[PDB]
Amino acid sequence: NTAPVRSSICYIDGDEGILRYRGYPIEELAESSSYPEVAYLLMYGNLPSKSQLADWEFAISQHSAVPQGVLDIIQGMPHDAHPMGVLVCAMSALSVFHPDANPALRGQDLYKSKQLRDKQIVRILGKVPTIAAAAYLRLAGRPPVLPSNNFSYSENFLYMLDSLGNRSYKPNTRLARVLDILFILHAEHEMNCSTAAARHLASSGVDVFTALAGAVGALYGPLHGGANEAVLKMLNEIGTVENIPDFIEGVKNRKRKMSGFGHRVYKNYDPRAKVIRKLAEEVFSIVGRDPLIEVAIALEKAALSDEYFIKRKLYPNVDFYSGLIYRAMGFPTEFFPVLFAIPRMAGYLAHWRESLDDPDTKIMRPQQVYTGVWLRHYTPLQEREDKLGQVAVSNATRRRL
Amino acid sequence: PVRSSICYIDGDEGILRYRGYPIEELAESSSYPEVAYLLMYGNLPSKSQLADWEFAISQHSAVPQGVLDIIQGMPHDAHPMGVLVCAMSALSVFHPDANPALRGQDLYKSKQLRDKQIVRILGKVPTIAAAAYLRLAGRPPVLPSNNFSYSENFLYMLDSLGNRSYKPNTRLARVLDILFILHAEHEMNCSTAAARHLASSGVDVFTALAGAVGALYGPLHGGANEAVLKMLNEIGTVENIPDFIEGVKNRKRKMSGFGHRVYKNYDPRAKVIRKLAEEVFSIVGRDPLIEVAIALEKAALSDEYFIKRKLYPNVDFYSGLIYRAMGFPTEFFPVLFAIPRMAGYLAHWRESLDDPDTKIMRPQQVYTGVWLRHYTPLQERTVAVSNATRRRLAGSR
Amino acid sequence: PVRSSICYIDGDEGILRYRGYPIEELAESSSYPEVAYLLMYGNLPSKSQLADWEFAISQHSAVPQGVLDIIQGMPHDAHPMGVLVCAMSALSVFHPDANPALRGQDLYKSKQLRDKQIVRILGKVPTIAAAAYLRLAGRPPVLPSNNFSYSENFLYMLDSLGNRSYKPNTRLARVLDILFILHAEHEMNCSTAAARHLASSGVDVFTALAGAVGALYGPLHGGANEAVLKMLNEIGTVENIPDFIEGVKNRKRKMSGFGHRVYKNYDPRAKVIRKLAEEVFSIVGRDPLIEVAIALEKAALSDEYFIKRKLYPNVDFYSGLIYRAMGFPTEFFPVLFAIPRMAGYLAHWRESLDDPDTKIMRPQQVYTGVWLRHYTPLQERTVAVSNATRRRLAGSR
Amino acid sequence: PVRSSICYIDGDEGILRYRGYPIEELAESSSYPEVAYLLMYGNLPSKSQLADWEFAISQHSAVPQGVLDIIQGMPHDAHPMGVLVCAMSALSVFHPDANPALRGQDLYKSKQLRDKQIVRILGKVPTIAAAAYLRLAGRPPVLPSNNFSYSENFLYMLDSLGNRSYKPNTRLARVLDILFILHAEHEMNCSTAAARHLASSGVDVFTALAGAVGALYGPLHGGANEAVLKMLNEIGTVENIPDFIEGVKNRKRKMSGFGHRVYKNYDPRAKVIRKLAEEVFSIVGRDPLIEVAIALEKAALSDEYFIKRKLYPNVDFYSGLIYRAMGFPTEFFPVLFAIPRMAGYLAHWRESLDDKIMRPQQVYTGVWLRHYTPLQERTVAVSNATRRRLAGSR
């Protein structure tokens, strides 16, 4: 707490559900707008003109031709890995593949032009979805396919998601729009470790690639991502509906724990849950259902009839339904966290110039308490508790003598 | 609040205390693994302790080879800093037993794995730095050795020319080790702030640091030496010095390379590297930048500017001239500055994982935007420099 | 049935003989190719035979750039057993000159071919058994360097420090050879017959060996260390010894399987090897997997319940222990049962090629299907799990 | 001693049945996947059952992406069956469902695991194996589309010439489908015993079928009809009918591939293969060599010597004639001979998990016991490489 810095992209009150993107509330943007629209709304404050953003969309389209360096660096990676590490490595390579764009060696005055801001933002937006899809389908085995640029951001990703080089493959509107809305819902969150580090990365005058590298690497940790897979495996191992009674009493007497029905940010009224529920029903119509989906539906219906869930504010959260939806698009659990990151960068970039134009943010001296020896003098190693990093020497008796 | 007891700086007196030890006491006789274990645990490494520490450091000196495929991946003219961060990102990926993606949170709580990965990354980083140096010339890379300690083993890595019977010049090895130790750790800085800010937020130590080191890419300190280098180069002959001595006092041209924004009284590091600069001039010779540098050092002190303004030759001057002496290319300084800082990040990261009582709460903010607006469709939207033109626009025109 | 002049097993008594030669005197002071020849050609060879056989098998091993490329980048989602099976399957074609189905109609009936073939195949495995480790930690390929004995070269393929100027250890080779002779020959067993007589007429020799080793991979049908890997874990160092030794009496926590598939009472060979085992115990270091096994073997050979059910750790358990202690991975358990078992099956191949007593097995099937059922045409016919990967079907729509 | 109800060879009369279903009501009123379902389950599928079963077989054909690396990675004069075994041995290190080390107890227990593995085998067999024929042809692999018939799918993937939407002729596909059922399974030849023994051993299916196909090429069931091809050359022109056959009646002129090891009487299979052979004649022509085969067969059908010995040509002869009519390499023939047999393995597989190790007996013939002397006093190979460099240096 004790706010030393300001935020101008949005005002948020999760305990009251007040979402205030540039004064505009969340619901209108969710039900009416699109991802580039909310991106413009957050970065510029106002709402844009068709042309204003037509130009924006066409600028973003004229990108996504990533060097072969990332492609063979991710094909040169073994089949067992984590795809988001693939993202961060390819994006560090993007840092490498654009040495002309860095200000780190041409002084801290190089970044004073608006044109370079526009170019960096448009390049990052064009490049990220292609890289995400390439990592996805490379983990699926199929080599990263090349981009065809005739669809919207979500639908161009869908073509990038799987096309097999086909021209006939057309996007599905329903899943595209629900995925766009889900992107909007996770377009920004109250300042995480990533944004806090990124404001000072901007204060350091370093490449935007590297700054968002630090941001996404902050997003890597299971502090953020360790919810969706946890809830998915909760539902998987709870299994059949017959295991629901002995489970629900298990939370009534506090011998079993439910993950996904509680979140401090929203333990109460949040119509975004209703929005994603309607989108979930549409997704069920467009693709079908899975046994875990039916089990979750039965569990939530029992929960509504149960006083323990409502009284303790244990109502299903956004992460629960959203993860069900990511499963519904046939996405593996391992590829969950990346889907939570593609939109957030937008809001992160919305702070970049916002952090650049704020004079207060600079290089800082953090405060600390040094209780160590104030004055201890060195001693030669002549007159002179732990295993000292005990290395198991059992496979080194034949390969290392 | 966030608090740690890793080290102390006396700003007025310019004192560095790695657990109460003056930095000069270290640089007089210390070894790199010795001071690494010293600061990262707050206690001196004893005979058995230091022996086991250097043993472990020398054992896993071998770096994986997937990262060698990686270094072959990056182009010839690539800046080694991005090369370095990419290399450790690939290394992260290349240690599945050490990542939180498949081992939960307990994996980063046991002391045995903590150390193991600490010494692992401490081995890996200089190997990749040497690979970057050597591939920078396009020459085929080399294997690591294990029959020495840290700095001179790295130098044995640096100079083999295909001959595995080389050896390190002990004077050169010692001076390089002192060069590494001088920039070991400063009390909490912006890069260090990002370091432990990531660290306590449950992320994989690998790429973890990857960033913290990319934080130095900025010209906060990664371009400071280039400034003094280019100014001394553009000055030229000694004849240009006197008028430029007036010129700097005329406020038309600034002077960096003299003093410190956090140390003033002194920085014993400047004295010790002055001694080592005399030694390196003795052991390698003289070059035109060297005598112009020493002439500036002798002349600028006589002028009343530094007498009244107070600007005492900063470690930057001697570090840059020594780097020029050691055959280091101009662009290779920042990774060299990166090599020492890894010890500080490792110590801070281990300490941060040590104490669960320290938390990074969600900071408050005060909105500076409008309190209420509303959405209208766009059709009625009443009515840039996004894409460069005259290149493809003219091509299509 | 088959005529046995090669080796006999008294499974219910406990004496094994390589052509009427008891295991004791033979295995104590013999060599791997000596045993190979003696099994191969009846009466024991002479020094000239020794020189010819050893020189030929040493010279006929190296492979320039063959099946190595089929590995060194391919994923490892299981044990290298499949890797080695694929490796020798490709070796079956990298030298098509070693094939009888492409010239005339039969060629192993030629003594010179059969001889050169058998020499190579007995000596060909080392070069790819080298790659058996080359794709689990990732060191670059090293030359076979065919200038030593069988086990000496084979362990140099693992112990070379990536260096062309390293001398392999010899006592490790001696241990490997004695253990090879320990697991040298068994009579018909899981697929062991199913390969031999199948190559009696057959079409090739590589394919039969690959099929046999592939059929001998599972945790308990010829291997015994894959299963007991977990029963050796989670039992601490000394504190869980009473717990496990009481649970095994109470049947709650015990081992997987002991003895052989025909041997269950007595085996005098491994006992002396067990003594040499403790010679290993003080030279290859210590780790929780071995000291616990020491007390297990001490207890589970004379305690009450074990002698009730004749549960003493089998020869496979000791072999896996000694090998994993050598410096081998926790998985190289079956790749080495191949080395002497192959030689046994080569001797079986020659013998079965000699005696014409390899007959196909007649059927005694129980046909429960009806003797006649009428037409059931689909057109007049009126309407499994069929569960499929159907992640998305509306994408194309 | 093997006891099973999969099939019944009746050599003296010629009454074969698939779970009780004879060829006479199958080769003209059924499809190969339908018989596959029958032999999996011992009962006829229904039209909806057939629909879901064919959907399941078709949908799953995801070849692993490494095989492209292997196929263009060995000496290029490799043996076709050798390329087959290399490719599928490479497959053996791809799918982690076939590791008995991982599944300690649950290897092949659930019906889900069973049928999933069955389809995982069947779907990608030719793509893994028969697509290597393109390499000897010299063309890159063509990805299959499982919207055609399975035999049509095979003909599409092998014969496409480089077109995305090629249409295989939907007349030969029925013949290729029937050819499987004609010579689907036969008991205890050499390798079915190996398959049942290894399935008793309780192993995975990948290495099992790899060893099985490697052992199939035994030139008593692998050289099914190669040898007679050489005979089809020594006749030359048809005018060598009488003089040759009397020489055969003199027992002085070589012959091959007549009768059968387990069959010696009439077979409706002979009639159906004759009809299929003449139909493939009519649709894709011949060479004079096929006419030579026809002439020698018509000579054998009217010669008293063969009638005395109840001699009729084996099915493999007409199978080779048909495979030559469709213009495929003769040494490529074993590929066109290994596809159906594995099917009867799978049911065997399933049935082998329903009812052991089965070590056979033997007789010891060598010396019983003798003393051993160390190698030093063991004083007093079989080839010495006559082209000796030392002998060329001394």
PDB file of C-alpha atoms in Angstrom, chain D residues 231-233 235-241 277-278 281 285-300 317-318 320-322 324-325:
ATOM      1  CA  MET D 231      10.382 -69.848 -63.144  1.00  0.00           C
ATOM      2  CA  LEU D 232       8.204 -67.403 -65.091  1.00  0.00           C
ATOM      3  CA  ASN D 233      11.465 -66.375 -66.800  1.00  0.00           C
ATOM      4  CA  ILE D 235       9.716 -70.637 -69.750  1.00  0.00           C
ATOM      5  CA  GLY D 236      10.329 -67.604 -71.958  1.00  0.00           C
ATOM      6  CA  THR D 237       7.736 -67.771 -74.728  1.00  0.00           C
ATOM      7  CA  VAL D 238       4.529 -69.785 -74.384  1.00  0.00           C
ATOM      8  CA  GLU D 239       5.596 -72.197 -77.137  1.00  0.00           C
ATOM      9  CA  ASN D 240       7.654 -73.890 -74.384  1.00  0.00           C
ATOM     10  CA  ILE D 241       4.499 -75.511 -72.932  1.00  0.00           C
ATOM     11  CA  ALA D 277      -6.992 -61.671 -61.617  1.00  0.00           C
ATOM     12  CA  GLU D 278      -8.885 -61.677 -64.913  1.00  0.00           C
ATOM     13  CA  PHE D 281      -6.380 -58.034 -66.458  1.00  0.00           C
ATOM     14  CA  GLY D 285      -3.768 -54.736 -69.187  1.00  0.00           C
ATOM     15  CA  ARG D 286      -0.829 -57.126 -69.140  1.00  0.00           C
ATOM     16  CA  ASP D 287       2.544 -58.027 -70.573  1.00  0.00           C
ATOM     17  CA  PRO D 288       3.455 -61.219 -72.466  1.00  0.00           C
ATOM     18  CA  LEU D 289       4.818 -62.563 -69.155  1.00  0.00           C
ATOM     19  CA  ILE D 290       1.310 -62.676 -67.672  1.00  0.00           C
ATOM     20  CA  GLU D 291       0.201 -64.553 -70.790  1.00  0.00           C
ATOM     21  CA  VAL D 292       3.086 -66.990 -70.241  1.00  0.00           C
ATOM     22  CA  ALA D 293       1.816 -67.560 -66.704  1.00  0.00           C
ATOM     23  CA  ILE D 294      -1.692 -68.115 -68.096  1.00  0.00           C
ATOM     24  CA  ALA D 295      -0.399 -70.606 -70.666  1.00  0.00           C
ATOM     25  CA  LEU D 296       1.629 -72.605 -68.145  1.00  0.00           C
ATOM     26  CA  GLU D 297      -1.328 -72.680 -65.745  1.00  0.00           C
ATOM     27  CA  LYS D 298      -3.697 -73.887 -68.474  1.00  0.00           C
ATOM     28  CA  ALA D 299      -1.111 -76.550 -69.308  1.00  0.00           C
ATOM     29  CA  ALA D 300      -0.914 -77.626 -65.661  1.00  0.00           C
ATOM     30  CA  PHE D 317       1.089 -67.308 -57.401  1.00  0.00           C
ATOM     31  CA  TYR D 318      -2.085 -65.472 -58.401  1.00  0.00           C
ATOM     32  CA  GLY D 320       1.907 -62.130 -57.288  1.00  0.00           C
ATOM     33  CA  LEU D 321       0.269 -61.993 -60.710  1.00  0.00           C
ATOM     34  CA  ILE D 322      -2.298 -59.491 -59.416  1.00  0.00           C
ATOM     35  CA  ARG D 324       2.350 -57.314 -60.922  1.00  0.00           C
ATOM     36  CA  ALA D 325      -0.742 -56.345 -62.925  1.00  0.00           C
TER      37      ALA D 325
END
